[PDB]
Amino acid sequence: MREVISIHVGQGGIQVGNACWELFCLEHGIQPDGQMPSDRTIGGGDDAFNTFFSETGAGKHVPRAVFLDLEPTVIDEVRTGTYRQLFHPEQLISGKEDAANNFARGHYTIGKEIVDLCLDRIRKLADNCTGLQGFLVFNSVGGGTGSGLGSLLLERLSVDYGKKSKLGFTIYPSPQVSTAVVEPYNSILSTHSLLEHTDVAVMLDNEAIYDICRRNLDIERPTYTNLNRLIAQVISSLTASLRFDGALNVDITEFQTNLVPYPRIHFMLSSYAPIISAEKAYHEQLSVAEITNSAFEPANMMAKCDPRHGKYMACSMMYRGDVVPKDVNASIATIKTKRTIQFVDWCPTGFKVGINYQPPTVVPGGDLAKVMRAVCMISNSTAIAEVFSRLDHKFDLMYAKRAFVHWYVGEGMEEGEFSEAREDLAALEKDYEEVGIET
Amino acid sequence: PPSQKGMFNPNYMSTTHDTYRPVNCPNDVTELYQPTWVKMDRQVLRFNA
Amino acid sequence: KNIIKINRLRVGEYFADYDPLRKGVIPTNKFRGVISQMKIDLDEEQILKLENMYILQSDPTKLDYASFLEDVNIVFTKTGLEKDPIAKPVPFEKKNAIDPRDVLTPQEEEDLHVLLLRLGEVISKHRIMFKTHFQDKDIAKSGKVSFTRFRSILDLHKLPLTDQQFKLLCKRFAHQGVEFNYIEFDEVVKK
Amino acid sequence: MREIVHIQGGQCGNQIGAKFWEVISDEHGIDPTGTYHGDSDLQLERINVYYNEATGGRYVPRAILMDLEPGTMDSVRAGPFGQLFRPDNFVFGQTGAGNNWAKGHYTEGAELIDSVLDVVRKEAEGCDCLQGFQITHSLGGGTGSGMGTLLISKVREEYPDRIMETFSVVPSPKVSDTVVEPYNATLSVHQLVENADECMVIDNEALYDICFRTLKLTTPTYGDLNHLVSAAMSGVTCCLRFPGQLNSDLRKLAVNLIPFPRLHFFMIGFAPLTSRGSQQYRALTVPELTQQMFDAKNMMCAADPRHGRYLTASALFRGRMSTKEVDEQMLNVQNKNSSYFVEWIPNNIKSSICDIPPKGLKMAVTFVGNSTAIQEMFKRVAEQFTAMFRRKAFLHWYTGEGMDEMEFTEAESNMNDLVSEYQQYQDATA
Amino acid sequence: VENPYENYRIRKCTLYYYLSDGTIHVNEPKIMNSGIEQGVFIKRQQIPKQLNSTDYYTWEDLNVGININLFERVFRIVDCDSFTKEFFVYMGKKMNSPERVP
Amino acid sequence: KVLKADGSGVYLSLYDFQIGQDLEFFGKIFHIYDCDIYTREFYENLGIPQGA
Amino acid sequence: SKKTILSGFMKNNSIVGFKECLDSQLQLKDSKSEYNDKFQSKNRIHRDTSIFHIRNKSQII
Numbered sequence A: 001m002r003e004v005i006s007i008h009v010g011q012g013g014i015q016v017g018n019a020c021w022e023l024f025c026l027e028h029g030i031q032p033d034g035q036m037p038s039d040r041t042i043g044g045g046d047d048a049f050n051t052f053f054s055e056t057g058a059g060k061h062v063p064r065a066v067f068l069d070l071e072p073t074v075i076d077e078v079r080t081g082t083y084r085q086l087f088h089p090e091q092l093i094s095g096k097e098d099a100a101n102n103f104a105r106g107h108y109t110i111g112k113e114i115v116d117l118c119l120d121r122i123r124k125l126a127d128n129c130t131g132l133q134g135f136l137v138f139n140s141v142g143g144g145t146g147s148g149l150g151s152l153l154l155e156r157l158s159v160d161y162g163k164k165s166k167l168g169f170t171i172y173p174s175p176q177v178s179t180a181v182v183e184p185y186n187s188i189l190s191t192h193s194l195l196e197h198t199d200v201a202v203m204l205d206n207e208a209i210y211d212i213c214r215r216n217l218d219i220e221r222p223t224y225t226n227l228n229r230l231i232a233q234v235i236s237s238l239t240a241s242l243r244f245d246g247a248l249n250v251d252i253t254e255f256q257t258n259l260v261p262y263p264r265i266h267f268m269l270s271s272y273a274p275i276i277s278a279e280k281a282y283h284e285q286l287s288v289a290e291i292t293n294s295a296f297e298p299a300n301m302m303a304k305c306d307p308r309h310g311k312y313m314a315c316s317m318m319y320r321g322d323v324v325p326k327d328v329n330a331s332i333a334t335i336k337t338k339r340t341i342q343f344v345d346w347c348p349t350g351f352k353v354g355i356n357y358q359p360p361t362v363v364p365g366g367d368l369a370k371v372m373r374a375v376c377m378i379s380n381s382t383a384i385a386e387v388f389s390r391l392d393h394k395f396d397l398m399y400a401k402r403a404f405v406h407w408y409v410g411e412g413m414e415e416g417e418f419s420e421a422r423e424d425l426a427a428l429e430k431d432y433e434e435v436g437i438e439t
Numbered sequence B: 001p002p003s004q005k006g007m008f009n010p011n012y013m014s015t016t017h018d019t020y021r022p023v024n025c026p027n028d029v030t031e032l033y034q035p036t037w038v039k040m041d042r043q044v045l046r047f048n049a
Numbered sequence C: 001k002n003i004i005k006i007n008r009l010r011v012g013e014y015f016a017d018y019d020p021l022r023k024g025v026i027p028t029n030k031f032r033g034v035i036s037q038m039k040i041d042l043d044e045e046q047i048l049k050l051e052n053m054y055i056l057q058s059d060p061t062k063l064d065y066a067s068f069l070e071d072v073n074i075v076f077t078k079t080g081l082e083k084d085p086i087a088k089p090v091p092f093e094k095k096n097a098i099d100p101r102d103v104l105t106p107q108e109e110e111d112l113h114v115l116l117l118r119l120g121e122v123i124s125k126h127r128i129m130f131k132t133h134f135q136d137k138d139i140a141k142s143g144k145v146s147f148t149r150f151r152s153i154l155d156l157h158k159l160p161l162t163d164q165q166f167k168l169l170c171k172r173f174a175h176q177g178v179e180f181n182y183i184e185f186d187e188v189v190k191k
Numbered sequence D: 001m002r003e004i005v006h007i008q009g010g011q012c013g014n015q016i017g018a019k020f021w022e023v024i025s026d027e028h029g030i031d032p033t034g035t036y037h038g039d040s041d042l043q044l045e046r047i048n049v050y051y052n053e054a055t056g057g058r059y060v061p062r063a064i065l066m067d068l069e070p071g072t073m074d075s076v077r078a079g080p081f082g083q084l085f086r087p088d089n090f091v092f093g094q095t096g097a098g099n100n101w102a103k104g105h106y107t108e109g110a111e112l113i114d115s116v117l118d119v120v121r122k123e124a125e126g127c128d129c130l131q132g133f134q135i136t137h138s139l140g141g142g143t144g145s146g147m148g149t150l151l152i153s154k155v156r157e158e159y160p161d162r163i164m165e166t167f168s169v170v171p172s173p174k175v176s177d178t179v180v181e182p183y184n185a186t187l188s189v190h191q192l193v194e195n196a197d198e199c200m201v202i203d204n205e206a207l208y209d210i211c212f213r214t215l216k217l218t219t220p221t222y223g224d225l226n227h228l229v230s231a232a233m234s235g236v237t238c239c240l241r242f243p244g245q246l247n248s249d250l251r252k253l254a255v256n257l258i259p260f261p262r263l264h265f266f267m268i269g270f271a272p273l274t275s276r277g278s279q280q281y282r283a284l285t286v287p288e289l290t291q292q293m294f295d296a297k298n299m300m301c302a303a304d305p306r307h308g309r310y311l312t313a314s315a316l317f318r319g320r321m322s323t324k325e326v327d328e329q330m331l332n333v334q335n336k337n338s339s340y341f342v343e344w345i346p347n348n349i350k351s352s353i354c355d356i357p358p359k360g361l362k363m364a365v366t367f368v369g370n371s372t373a374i375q376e377m378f379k380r381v382a383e384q385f386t387a388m389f390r391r392k393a394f395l396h397w398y399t400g401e402g403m404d405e406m407e408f409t410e411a412e413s414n415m416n417d418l419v420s421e422y423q424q425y426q427d428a429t430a
Numbered sequence E: 001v002e003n004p005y006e007n008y009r010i011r012k013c014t015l016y017y018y019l020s021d022g023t024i025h026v027n028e029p030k031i032m033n034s035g036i037e038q039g040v041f042i043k044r045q046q047i048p049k050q051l052n053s054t055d056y057y058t059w060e061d062l063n064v065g066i067n068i069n070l071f072e073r074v075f076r077i078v079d080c081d082s083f084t085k086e087f088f089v090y091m092g093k094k095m096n097s098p099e100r101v102p
Numbered sequence F: 001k002v003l004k005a006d007g008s009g010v011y012l013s014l015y016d017f018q019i020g021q022d023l024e025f026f027g028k029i030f031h032i033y034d035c036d037i038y039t040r041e042f043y044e045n046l047g048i049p050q051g052a
Numbered sequence G: 001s002k003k004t005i006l007s008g009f010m011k012n013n014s015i016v017g018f019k020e021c022l023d024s025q026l027q028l029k030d031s032k033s034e035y036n037d038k039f040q041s042k043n044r045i046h047r048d049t050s051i052f053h054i055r056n057k058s059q060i061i
């Protein structure tokens, strides 16, 4: 009787939603057409799919998701793909004209004629549920329509629903690799917008995941699909506790009460282990100690940040498979013993642990192998200030000469809107600095 | 459906390949070893009672 | 084909709006709806026989209409191909549908000729004209009512007949099962 | 959806557009009889961007052929794929401008343009949701450079929110075929800078240089030059018609490439370009494609990129390739050539990927780079213009049509103002 | 399709072949009250046998009463000029019996 | 995993499931009467077919 | 009969270097795109777990 609704807005959100939903369907045994096979069942128990799906009454299942875009290309590709029969036809909402990498276009001009339909669909989906845990929202943060529509959606939801929890899994631009040129602008604006509207945010930039793929999976020419598969595995490991029995279960509401010291500071970076290919996955025991050492290893963070440059506030780790609590305790004791990892003094105990019995599932044709154990990490640390500092520097470099400002001013935005977001980011930096100091 | 390996020309055999032949096996193993649990994944029987 | 021929209905546009990606395949239910909407009468057996092989072998949901459009539009013109100058399209006149009901399958038509001759002879001797009563009896001015009122007029002018030859005549000249038209009857008893 | 219409002006414009439409029809599998004979299902999904469907099942381009002389359109009709065009879209006069910008913009064009405006309005209102217009014309010919620019002014005045791209061929000093080129070139640039949303400059001199050095073919011809221009033109808007890893259309390109509203002149190039004998021996990879892309001699302009600094650059890839490799290659180029890239805007290169390769190639790339080196073109054009104008040579042929020297002086002053403020950002520092 | 009087139209045109350089020119004459924008059909140029190839037509591939492909349009040559008749017999190439255009 | 109810200390296996045969799970007696299509095919492969 | 055939009409209406690209470079099907290599495969409820380790040095590409 526990439910959660996932919102995919923008091309990046849709392309990561494809991976996460194919992974969920494969994990729960639902065929791509939406019908569970009459024979050849893969799992016992009941209402496991009820967290993400909803029984139609007889036969198929419907995802609890809605797709948004202002360009019809990706939505038409989805509607032509093999998953055409899965989604309801009136939740693949598509516009006519794109925002064209313009936050003002996506927030003031062409998103206001689609947010109404989106919110109506959200209400229709939420009426079906009874124990709604919260909302998940996916959006690339450096894109015009993604940023603007996410801003508008969360702004409307915060007042229509109120206390309900919302989780955002953003994809920030890399420190030096990027595909656009104006993305610092809308990244700053959207960070401003979602800072006061998101309960939990995750940093999932692309360069670090590229390095992870190059090192562990031994891939030299990866595409976006591998990155989306890794992100989907993170989501599955995160949400497995809602739909699978475990020794120590953790709910969605068990994150804001344990990882957010202050209402302003809710940005976290994720780590996952093990990432290994089948050619070498079976030559080592993959013990819990070694997988948690790999998880804590600084080069395996999915965001291009260095945890060695700052203190740790708190940590959240979820193990799935056949892990033992005394093994977990020994591993945490060893991690605390380690000297190169330091916590803040006002957080003596900084770990929240979870144990689940369902091992991760493997997608045929994918890169990962099959393992008995896995760990996913969500950590809050003072080291996250460097990304804000570097995007602030990049924003200042272009805003000194008022470059590209007219393309945003001409779409209803005021001239001073950039400035207020600027001091909001500076204030966030000062808040991190103030929290991180000793006593 | 094992791989070909039909081209095994003796005229191009290296010295260390010619000496260290597969011992205590009928032939050269080609299938990559995998544990039991990965082989029997997602295999569930069902009965009505 | 005959209905599209005579009523001049263009089914091309009403399928395009349901296939915006130029795929050429539309769901079967929308096909049923659009084909019923075009004023052409539909029968359950006829709808099932239109499903036939126009459905895709993959599940009972998809139906390709491009072949259907090509098959029904051949009557208007052979517009599909222009790069063969020898081939020539056929000017169109109504092809009557061949069916056992409308044809005198057994050979007794010779006595029908004898009856037609006898009617012609008697109508010539008595110089009787009776189209006016036929056109008076009906009000739709399309086809006369069934034979139970047709015998009344044939008896009004003194010219009755027994059960056998009347049965043969009404069977020959009946259309659609119960209706009995008259204009072709007058054109048959022609001078 | 989001379709665009096509308008052609002048003999050069018609010659370019004929090859462009032939290339597009070959790409989409449309025979010159207007009957589809393709093989891939993706060839018909987005055909409404450039085509209209007529009863009988044939496809007609939404192109308008407008000119002041019937000869060149009577010629282009008789060519292959010339029967596609609707005969109603042909609009022409009977007199001709005679390489006189004043005649083509004041006397004859102003009288004629009502009909072509009517047909343009009809074509623009026919579409479901207009995306923009694209124009092909030359800035050396009278009727083209005048009537087309007045048409641009009127179209902009009627559709203030849509996008206007123009592919312009400017006269070069080395290759000149007209004695009065600088006058109408300057007069055309004056009107183009204020109205055009996007402009792409092409030189016959650069096209000949490319055909002589890269392709190593003995006899370059206008057919080959138009083939170059047509491939480059189709590469820009391929991503609007075909699915890609990163979707990016003309509005996105303009937003990401134009820093300030008055700097919208771009210089383009295409890759790969190989000789016939060396096609079998070269290997197509992202590093090879990007090195031939950033090669200076491969540009379609007489402007030499290493005499200035790139403001922004854009690359449009076609085929199946890895985004990681693409991004690392562009980063490597930017790091190795840091001196040619302006510094007060970080990471000033944009990238895009489209999964459908051009017909007959494994990979291809289209390059659009806003570089500060184009000022030399304007400087030499203004030098020739002032050299001819200090003595009022050939001036009566323009002053006899109601135009005075004040307009010439204003055009020259605005042209030099453009050059100066465009060079300012080359030396501006942080 | 939509013309009440007609279902198919027959367009007639004359084909000129040049011996100087082996090039082909085709145009259709004008018809009074034809309502069709009629004129030159194909410029004076070499026409390959198939589209986008380098195998051009020669004078030995032309004959009367035969189908010919010109940019995926299939013309049917009905008759030839009187002067052309002496050319084939002078070159020794046999000609066929001409029909009439319907 | 469920220990056998006979007290021998051995876990149940694939060969303890037969249509029409009773079992014992924690003081209860289950009578099984039907199985899915896949299970029937699996047992036939080994050489131990199930009952009707 | 090598260069004596040239004429104005024939010369200017013939493309020399922009005809069809030579084959072995045409070997891409325009029908196949992204999201169709992997999300249009078919997907299987039970996969094939057999993996082979051959004694041949992997080709470098």
Ligand SMILES: Nc1nc2c(ncn2[C@@H]2O[C@H](COP(=O)(O)OP(=O)(O)OP(=O)(O)O)[C@@H](O)[C@H]2O)c(=O)[nH]1
Residues within 6 Å of the ligand: A009, A010, A011, A012, A013, A015, A016, A071, A098, A099, A100, A101, A102, A140, A141, A142, A143, A144, A145, A146, A147, A171, A173, A178, A179, A180, A183, A206, A224, A225, A227, A228, D245, D246, D247
């Ligand atoms: N992780 C990941 N990021 C992506 C993917 N595709 C695009 N992005 C990111 O998204 C950013 C730009 O936004 P887009 O995804 O192209 O589209 P958008 O956010 O909806 O904005 P628009 O382009 O205006 O539609 C790029 O900088 C990429 O970093 C993807 O497949 N995976």
Ligand SMILES: Nc1nc2c(ncn2[C@@H]2O[C@H](COP(=O)(O)OP(=O)(O)O)[C@@H](O)[C@H]2O)c(=O)[nH]1
Residues within 6 Å of the ligand: D009, D010, D011, D012, D015, D016, D099, D138, D140, D141, D142, D143, D144, D145, D176, D177, D178, D204, D222, D223, D225, D226
């Ligand atoms: N690329 C290309 N350029 C051409 C062609 N024909 C002419 N030009 C150029 O166009 C210029 C003459 O412009 P013109 O055609 O008279 O313009 P118009 O007066 O508008 O018709 C010359 O300087 C040529 O360089 C062609 O076929 N291809």
Ligand SMILES: [Mg+2]
Residues within 6 Å of the ligand: A011, A071, A098, D247, D248
């Ligand atoms: Mg986009």
